[PDB]
Amino acid sequence: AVESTGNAKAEAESRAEAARIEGEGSVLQAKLKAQALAIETEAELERVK
Amino acid sequence: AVESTGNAKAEAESRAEAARIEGEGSVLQAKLKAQALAIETEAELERVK
């Protein structure tokens, strides 16, 4: 019981870790993507104007 | 009886463990996904506006 629960807990917490780093990393990368799209669509809107 | 119930209990608790880590991990990852979709659709709604 301790063995199977141990390994399953290990793989599961591994997925939780990957999910967390993917989480915050998605947050920051989406934020820089937000600034990028913002400045790009801004200059684009200007010159197109 | 103790043997079969023991092994079945082990595998079952293993599934419970995986279900729990999948649970909270789904919670946190869905939350970061929520912030990501929020900021992304926010900046998107702005520039599109």
Swiss-Prot record, chains A, B:
Phosphorylated on Tyr residues after EGF stimulation. It is found in: Cytoplasm; Nucleus. MVP 3 mediates interaction with PTEN. MVP 4 mediates interaction with PARP4. Required for normal vault structure. Vaults are multi-subunit structures that may act as scaffolds for proteins involved in signal transduction. Vaults may also play a role in nucleo-cytoplasmic transport. Down-regulates IFNG-mediated STAT1 signaling and subsequent activation of JAK. Down-regulates SRC activity and signaling through MAP kinases. The vault ribonucleoprotein particle is a huge (400 A x 670 A) cage structure of 12.9 MDa. It consists of a dimer of half-vaults, with each half-vault comprising 39 identical major vault protein (MVP) chains, PARP4 and one or more vault RNAs (vRNAs). Interacts with TEP1. Interacts with PTEN and activated MAPK1. The phosphorylated protein interacts with the SH2 domains of PTPN11 and SRC. Interacts with APEX1. May interact with ZNF540. This is Major vault protein. It comes from Rattus norvegicus. The lineage of its organism: Eukaryota, Metazoa, Chordata, Craniata, Vertebrata. The gene is Mvp.
